[PDB]
Design a protein around this ligand. Structure first.
Ligand SMILES: CC(C)C(=O)SCCNC(=O)CCNC(=O)[C@H](O)C(C)(C)COP(=O)(O)OP(=O)(O)OC[C@H]1O[C@@H](n2cnc3c(N)ncnc32)[C@H](O)[C@@H]1OP(=O)(O)O
Ligand SMILES: CC(C)C(=O)SCCNC(=O)CCNC(=O)[C@H](O)C(C)(C)COP(=O)(O)OP(=O)(O)OC[C@H]1O[C@@H](n2cnc3c(N)ncnc32)[C@H](O)[C@@H]1OP(=O)(O)O
Lengths: 360, 357
């Protein structure tokens, strides 16, 4: 199996959202990932490309046999991922303490939103709930409208799965010294809060306010925002640094002498009006050409369906084709132990065949 | 130094955005992080917590030499400059492999190491514009809105650099060697959004903005304005949670269009808008506490310190000006400690003494 995590063995108790995303990335980087779903599901080969780089197996964990075949896999594995409410694995007899008895090297990875304890620990939730409580959601969107969810990118993935991954891999490093596993408690409310640590730092130094749409990076700055073009499509401007901003202005055909200063926030309404009228005078692909090799920080805002035509995307093979659509190649990239193209989802496998393959 | 990464040594060449963030998290989890800045008081950027800062003109002979001495003693090097920059300093991968064949050489860029955009300046908003992400964010009648810099720099940036550094350290235990980790934000952010690429393939996600289950188009996955002008979030995807939300709103499910009849979503949204608008945020927070309705108050940063669930799990600690997030995630046996504030600049020889030779 190709990639830096070759030899790593992973047992994933099937869930939704961050847990399968984390499991995917371990698989992506070479890990041997075994996913235990309930038979209630099954039903053929999965259409969900997030379940790539997996072996799938069936098991009623509520039964005695299920529980024991599962504990057999866990006994022979480096990592367990579960993303159920707190107490589910305990009551099932797959809790940490029970796993510690059959394998004290195990990294026991717990993926939740609210965490393992506290008042909200038993409430159902999704990404939007977790980022609502820690100030993130309130900061996203235009000032003149209600907050808009940044899909499920910030709580589920950036502040969820990715912190689970770091925990798993950090614990594997620790196990090199200690000879012992441990429990990783990844909560989306905490992970997403560390993801936005910059804003908490700037807030303390007065460089970020709680007013939505009135900061440097939330759309409030005319030089960090999107602009509608003549064709109704968009470009993105990110020209924070003065030397990039000056390059953007020159490409737009605006003389700096006729504009207010870049960072005179009292005159941001005028500046936005000027930039708005300028960008609106030609179509997106015009601006794309004008700025193509520049430091002006102006890029076309592409829709998913257009991404496969962008030369830079094509040439670095960011994407690969699979089953009526592109999918992202693994990230990040490794010079010596490169990842391979992901294996598509396969048919289920018997849990015994796996215990056998894993030496048994 | 507390945490699972005790005894990991990290040299960080100072930059902006994702590199400092990755360094921070390594520090948070107990790595020994030395940050080389350029000689041009104590830094009040709390993202520079859990560091030792040294200055060195990396363009001088003595600065280069001192730096290669650090790197020789270290496990990981982080750099976030345009491609070519470290090479010309004499700090490229191959120069470093001469003094330390075990080094994890971690390169954090937006566009990657090669290709037509590899020398273009850029920020978060640019990297997410090219791969479909930015286009998908915001309301349908408006131009796309940047989700701060959370998706390109941090989620699809620093976090993938971390996954790469830590996976490479695992590979190192079996091979005895380091390697180069190439983390591009355009790549990481695309994997971060793999769920949308999956759903587009199964015909369950559209390129139309504001028209999808998770982009704000769904009336049961969106924010709602309350009687006081503050907001709740609703995330009631599962029918059983959705039903519970409707009951607590006082709405009879028989009077409403089906949850997932998308042609009638505008109608359903109008009905939920009127209901949520009739009480204030805190009323709804109370009504739905301990429920699976997936309704939560949308707090602004300055309110977060007063929320019971936040306080009791110590998600934050107080620093100088105000609150900062504690390290994440959390570990049973080797627990992170509270971050050390940004220290005063120390001399680079001191560090070398500390590190043996
Ligand atoms: C991708 C989109 C949708 C997002 O934005 S996702 C973020 C979703 N939230 C989370 O994952 C946070 C943590 N998880 C949760 O809060 C909850 O799993 C959830 C998502 C709210 C779903 O709640 P529920 O459906 O009440 O499930 P849970 O409380 O986790 O319990 C799982 C049940 O499955 C049972 N289970 C799980 N696997 C098995 C197998 N293989 N066999 C038998 N029983 C099983 C388990 O025993 C539980 O049954 P009960 O005994 O009846 O309680
Ligand atoms: C604003 C935030 C919040 C975001 O949204 S951040 C995401 C920003 N983008 C990135 O970091 C992607 C990768 N980095 C870059 O593209 C570029 O660094 C940048 C951000 C566009 C800035 O470009 P520049 O200021 O031209 O810097 P670089 O090209 O990286 O080169 C840095 C120079 O500093 C020099 N340098 C660096 N450290 C030192 C020290 N210690 N001593 C002396 N000289 C030094 C280095 O040798 C380079 O010199 P030259 O190539 O000979 O000019």
């Amino acid at each position: 199996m190709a990639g830096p995590l070759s030899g790593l063995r992973v047992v994933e108790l099937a869930g939704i959202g961050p847990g399968p995303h984390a499991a995917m990335i371990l698989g992506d980087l070479g890990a041997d990932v075994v996913r235990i779903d309930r038979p209630s599901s099954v039903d053929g080969i999965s259409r969900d490309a997030m379940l790539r780089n997996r072996r799938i197996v069936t098991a009623d964990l509520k039964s005695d046999q299920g529980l024991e075949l599962a504990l057999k896999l866990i006994a022979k594995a480096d990592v367990l991922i579960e993303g159920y409410r707190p107490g589910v694995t305990e009551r099932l007899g797959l809790g940490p303490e029970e796993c510690a008895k059959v394998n004290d090297r195990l990294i026991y990875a717990r993926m939740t939103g609210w965490g393992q304890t506290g008042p909200r620990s038993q409430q159902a939730g999704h990404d939007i709930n977790y980022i609502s409580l820690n100030g993130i959601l309130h900061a996203i969107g235009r000032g003149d409208e209600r907050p808009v969810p940044p899909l499920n990118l910030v709580g589920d993935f950036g502040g969820g799965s990715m912190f689970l991954l770091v925990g798993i891999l950090a614990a594997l490093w620790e196990r090199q010294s200690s000879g012992k596993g441990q429990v990783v408690d990844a909560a989306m409310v905490d992970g997403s809060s560390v993801l936005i640590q910059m804003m908490w730092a700037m807030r303390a130094t007065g460089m970020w306010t709680d007013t939505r749409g009135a900061n440097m990076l939330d759309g409030g700055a005319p030089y960090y925002d999107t602009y509608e073009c003549a064709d109704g499509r968009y470009v993105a401007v990110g020209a924070i640094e003065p030397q990039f901003y000056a390059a953007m202005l020159a490409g737009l055909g605006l003389d700096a002498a006729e504009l207010p200063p870049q960072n005179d926030r009292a005159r941001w309404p005028e500046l936005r009006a000027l930039l708005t009228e300028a960008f609106a005078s030609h179509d997106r692909d015009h601006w794309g050409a004008v700025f193509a090799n520049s430091d002006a920080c102006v890029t076309p805002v592409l829709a998913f369906g257009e991404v496969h035509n962008e030369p830079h995307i094509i040439e670095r093979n960011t994407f690969y084709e699979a089953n009526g659509g592109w999918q992202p190649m693994p990230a990040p990239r490794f010079s010596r132990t490169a990842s391979s193209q992901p294996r598509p989802p396969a048919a289920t496998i018997d849990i015994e065949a796996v215990l056998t393959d894993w030496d048994g």
